[PDB]
């Protein structure tokens, strides 16, 4: 049957979908420029755009 | 008749019949491939193909 799954091959699976997960947040984060507020419920804070 | 034989030969044939059935099976066993069982029934065993 096209809609579905073995039960045998669950571990499997899931450990490569754990590896697709892992895989593609090898990134690093990047600074950008920030902007004051003064929204009476963040008064003062820099923000990030 | 095409339907009648002798009862004093009966030996005789069934010593020819004996020889046929050797000389034939005078084989060797060849090994040929496997599979792994997806289904549950008989769980992970190796079957011949």
Do not use: K, W
Not at 28 to 43: A, I, M, V
């Amino acid at each position: 049957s096209v809609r579905g799954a073995n039960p045998l091959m669950f571990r499997a699976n899931v450990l490569h979908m754990l590896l697709e997960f892992v895989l593609d947040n090898l990134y690093l984060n990047r600074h950008t420029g920030f902007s004051q507020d003064h929204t009476p419920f963040t008064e003062g804070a820099n923000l990030r755009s």
